[PDB]
Design an enzyme around this catalytic site. Sequence first.
Site, PDB file in Angstrom:
ATOM      1  CD  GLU A 159      19.598  31.495  30.379  1.00 14.54           C
ATOM      2  OE1 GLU A 159      20.180  30.399  30.421  1.00 14.54           O
ATOM      3  OE2 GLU A 159      20.162  32.548  30.063  1.00 14.54           O
ATOM      4  CE  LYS A 190      23.318  33.886  30.710  1.00  9.40           C
ATOM      5  NZ  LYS A 190      22.843  32.999  29.575  1.00  9.40           N
ATOM      6  CB  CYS A 200      22.869  30.153  32.472  1.00  6.95           C
ATOM      7  SG  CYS A 200      23.719  28.757  31.603  1.00  6.95           S
TER       8      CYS A 200
END
Lengths: 657, 339, 340
Positions: free
Chosen positions: A53, A122, A177
């Site tokens: 990330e 994200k 994530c």
Amino acid sequence: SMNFYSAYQHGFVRVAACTHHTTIGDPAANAASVLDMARACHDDGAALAVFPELTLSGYSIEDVLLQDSLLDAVEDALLDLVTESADLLPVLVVGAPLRHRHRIYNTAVVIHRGAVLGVVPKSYLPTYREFYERRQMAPGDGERGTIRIGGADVAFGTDLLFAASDLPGFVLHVEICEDMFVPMPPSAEAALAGATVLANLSGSPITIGRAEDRRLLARSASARCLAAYVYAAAGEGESTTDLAWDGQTMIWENGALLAESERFPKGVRRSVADVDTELLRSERLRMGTFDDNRRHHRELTESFRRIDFALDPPAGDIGLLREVERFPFVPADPQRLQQDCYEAYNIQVSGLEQRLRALDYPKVVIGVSGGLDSTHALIVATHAMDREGRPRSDILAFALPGFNNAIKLARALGVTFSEIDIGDTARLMLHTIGHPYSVGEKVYDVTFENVQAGLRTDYLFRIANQRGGIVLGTGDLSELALGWSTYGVGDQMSHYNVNAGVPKTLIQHLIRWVISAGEFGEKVGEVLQSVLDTEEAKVGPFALQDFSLFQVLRYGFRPSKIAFLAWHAWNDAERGNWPPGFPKSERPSYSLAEIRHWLQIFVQRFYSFSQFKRSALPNGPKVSHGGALSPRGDWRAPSDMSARIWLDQIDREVPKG
Amino acid sequence: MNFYSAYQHGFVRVAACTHHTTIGDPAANAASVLDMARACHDDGAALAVFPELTLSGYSIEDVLLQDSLLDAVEDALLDLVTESADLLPVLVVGAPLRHRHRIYNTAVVIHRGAVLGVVPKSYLPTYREFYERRQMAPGDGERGTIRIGGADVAFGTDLLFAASDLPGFVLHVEICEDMFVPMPPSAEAALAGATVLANLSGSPITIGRAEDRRLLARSASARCLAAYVYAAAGEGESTTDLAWDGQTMIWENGALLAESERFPKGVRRSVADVDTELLRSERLRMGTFDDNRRHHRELTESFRRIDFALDPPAGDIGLLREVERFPFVPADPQRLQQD
Amino acid sequence: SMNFYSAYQHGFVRVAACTHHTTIGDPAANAASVLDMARACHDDGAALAVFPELTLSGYSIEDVLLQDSLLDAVEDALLDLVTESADLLPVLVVGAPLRHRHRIYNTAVVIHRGAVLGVVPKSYLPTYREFYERRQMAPGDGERGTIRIGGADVAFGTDLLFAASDLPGFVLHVEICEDMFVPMPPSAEAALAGATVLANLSGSPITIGRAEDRRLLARSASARCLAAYVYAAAGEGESTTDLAWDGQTMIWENGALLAESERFPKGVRRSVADVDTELLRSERLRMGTFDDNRRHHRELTESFRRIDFALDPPAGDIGLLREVERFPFVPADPQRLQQD
Ligand SMILES: Nc1ncnc2c1ncn2[C@@H]1O[C@H](COP(=O)(O)OP(=O)(O)OC[C@H]2O[C@@H]([n+]3cccc(C(=O)O)c3)[C@H](O)[C@@H]2O)[C@@H](O)[C@H]1O
Ligand SMILES: *CC(=O)CC[C@H](N)C(=O)O
Ligand SMILES: *CC(=O)CC[C@H](N)C(=O)O
Ligand SMILES: *CC(=O)CC[C@H](N)C(=O)O
């Protein structure tokens, strides 16, 4: 015509999960690491490289993420990565904080051969415990349209798909994530939409128990989505102001671990693996409830944008970065095998118990030859009776000599044993039928064999009628597969078959397990041990035909795919793992010629010859996740088909040696 | 306050049961179900989940389509419903039921003399050893109501059952294969506010299948910050082609709370006290959970909410839970070493 | 001016329903049979040739449909038939199990002059009694967009219409077996949207009375929808593990039987007939309530994708493959006349 040794040519895709050296606040330096790891991926012929990330910034830089010079440095480091990827073979997936409309987005830039394919924000920003992402970053959930990167508007949003145009089974989706930790993950809908390979970029500061959490959720995602899951986390170089990093990387396929890297490494690490896109294809092809779920969320799934790229993967031999086991029914890991065996055994026993309860506890008639199969079935039948509180003497076992082990086991167990010599009846039948043997001729043909086989069964069935019993089937899955049995009257026929779902390669290990449990005792142990030690070479090695059975029964793989797999598993005895119970001597290797020869025999026998005997099959429990062969269950096929197309695929696709 | 009351401390006593199936004989299945529900009642439990198609047997294939089978199922159901008038727990009992054109693979939610709702299985496996679409209709997208012995009770896949006197208890039901698809009914239910997910399973046992059940039930519970309550079919199911292990298990946020013997001789129950306050607290802290709800607002706001009152026991009924002495120090040696 | 003796120039369109020899699990053998029958349709100056359900694989093969070598062979045979259609006159409609997204669909592949025109999934998959289709195959209803068949994205779905730009009375809809048995058939809506010729590929194992059920529903479909209905069932070659097959073919037109073939033939059979497109045009022009029904289902009938192709049918004398009664007011059939 294909290069048989090419994994790309067998529907594999080489994926890599990478953890790089973070230099926080320094994108030119993170880029330089990324590039170096990307070139190693290229060298390995990998089609995908997923990094951690916010690769380009550092995940943990907090409000440094809001600094103009940070943001500017990132953008320039990206444009340089993109220019370098001109001559790289892998799709690169690389984290970066990027400006779009009013904010910065925690994004994944999907890069390939000199062009950005798409930027994926994200969806979901943890702002709790040690995480503060909503402070610096905007959610990506439900953003769309495009983003300008180096003079190009490129797909931007969370509904993107990267479909390889020369590799139809490789369709990439990216998440980040926390995206995979929420009830309704981005990637679940993208699997319904058609993604086969799910990438996840993580920062994931490490904490007691968290690596188990990553595993629980990346593995079950891969299982529930019938997908590969490619996972990379940050390590060395991230800020340790409040937190630590382990740089964990891993690759999952359909619930199985393909690869993983060392936790807390000194230096950079990669998991590289060959993903079988046909395994995924075959699984999806068969679980229609997967499609039912897509149609239920049609609006969700049909909305996805599909970006194409030509992967153009290497054509040659680049090995197989995959663990192909020799025995798909026999796991090499010894605690896994202990578990399979516990389960096989209890399946066989409980299946038969229910048959017996249902018939108000009939007597149990069984032909015992001293072979592995009948030996095992006797044991199974003994346990069934015990558990049901039935006397062991209600098992009526029969040795049926035609033209020590059995008797010893029978007596050790305390069952009712008897010998019936079928010889005189065989003689009378062969004469009545006018068989040359009845006048002295040593013609030992199928009829000669079958007359005996059939009479054994005829006898047992009449005993069963006379004595209020049922005849136990003894034939195993490998025999059902090949039609290595006598149809109708004989062998193939019984009131209930306990071994029906158990393949031959698994049988010996079940007996081993019975001895080990010790539940029957010293003498029984000894006789069973003896049976293993004392104990069809024109159907081939059962080890090869069980290997083929699994690929066809579970996946329906084409023959050249199976040859590839078997060759990789069985070619070198000194390579890969063997289950418990193979003394060094007992460890064969097989050439391509051997594997090809027996596969020709498998396809012919399995697809063409043998279905008819499978078609009129007695009852019995399914045992293996690999499948069973019942025509009321796992295997529905015609009894009147040729196997021409399989044999033709072998001629064209599999080299003769 | 009664200090020694698990209920007063925000616990909910939950039970997953595997009964003795008598295939094609509903009255006998109802007898085994009633016996086990009285045991649950004695234990002060608030929920009892039974296996898929409890009242008929899962494994009876076209016997499902026989009129006398369905009449007997309904008569057994009505009698079960009658008997719960006196029973503390909410019963969740499988039944093949007629509605409109077909029969559905249903779970009937029963509490204190009434049926609360009827939940059709969403996804019907029709592959390998499963043939469910031959006899049964998919429940996905079904709403409206269903006539069960003179009452029109809610029917469909969007139902929540909330204890008006115990707000941390919010019940959603799904059936076997419903938990194995990329987007489970139960994931959306959790976002809508379900805290306790039930699964009734048939689930013929195969090598490896318990590992699969485990992975999905555990990962469901962890991903959804919920208790997950699983009950599979066992002894009595037809062994014409299949074997049954009667596994039952109770998860909570990734932890295993209780599980029962595989391949038991006789009936088995997992019983465990779920910390609704644990669930509440994780939900409170993980904002991205609620962010996910808001992303699927229309999906999650459409759920229908059926209220019931539990009136659980006030007293000391122990605590069916393993509370470690050292939350920071696992007593298990392998785990402690990993830590 | 006009070639007076040309059926085409008088608004006829020639159609064939074909039953081929099945070789179960052998698409190259099925394709060679198809190609040969198609060559005979071409020689007859047929615009259209319909083959049985899953023509390329055999309908009766069950889990063999899930085999990679079965599906691959199906694909290769399919491409060769498309290459071979470059020199053929008729639109061919051949059944095939094809991969799309997650599953295989039970499809008809509409093929004309070296390209595929579209691919139509069976809408309703019987999973009852002798039928097990949801086990191997995905339902086709609601599916749109496109499918990649040999380096080309072609229309894919149950909303498709194949209109001849040079023969505007010939508008083709394709549906598959069970699709015509349901209260609301896909062909009904396709008729309201403009389809004049409705094709049905069937497997349809034969049972006492089933030929009577096929007739009831093909006939009334053709009458209620003011259309030709072209029907082909599977025949010899199919598996007799549990079933038998009668090879029935038939062509209907506004409730009237145009052609039908021998049941249980030894060898391949065809129905070939000239469909009168003006007869259909004429009934539709006059029965306004037909169009009223279309406007009632306007959203449903207006979203069909029209796919054009040029037929270039023969212009010369090819006879008339049609019964033309001398006395339209006096049926030559004695039992029919007695009733009249
Ligand atoms: N598709 C079909 N549909 C209906 N019937 C079909 C058929 N194909 C063959 N048949 C008929 O069935 C018969 C052939 O089948 P079958 O009777 O089984 O005879 P077959 O399979 O030809 O031979 C059985 C052989 O398997 C081996 N075997 C058997 C039993 C035990 C063991 C051992 O090692 O312990 C080994 C042994 O070599 C034996 O001779 C013929 O009468 C044939 O005409
Ligand atoms: C990067 C990330 O979202 C990890 C946080 C997650 N909720 C967890 O590990 O529990
Ligand atoms: C129903 C369940 O939870 C486990 C078994 C299921 N049918 C499967 O593994 O496919
Ligand atoms: C055409 C077909 O799928 C078989 C006939 C149908 N199942 C019926 O209802 O008769």
